[PDB]
């Protein structure tokens, strides 16, 4: 499966098992026994006006 969304640059560190914070607590949570990969990249040229 593939999941996609947009966050800040300082909130990419929260997409990881065992993390705390607003994004992990209220928006998107990962299992402890996760098997997969995480990918991120900057999108200033498209998502900023």
């Amino acid at each position: 499966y593939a999941d996609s969304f947009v966050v800040r640059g300082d909130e990419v560190r929260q997409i990881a098992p065992g993390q705390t914070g607003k994004i992990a607590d209220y928006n998107y949570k990962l299992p402890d026994d996760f098997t997969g990969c995480v990918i991120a990249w900057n999108s200033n040229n498209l998502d900023s006006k």
Binding site: R8, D10, R13, G18, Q19, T20, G21, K22
Partner: protein, 49 residues
Amino acid sequence: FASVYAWNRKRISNCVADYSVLYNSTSFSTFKCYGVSPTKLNDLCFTNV
């Protein structure tokens, strides 16, 4: 804030550590804990902060 060579130290006591009040105020670029898991911080009490 102080200079790095003359750094400052402050004592904290008799308080309730609800760090959810910082969510709308601050954005952090680095957060790392060493002797404790970040998901267990809501269930503990701390001695000599």
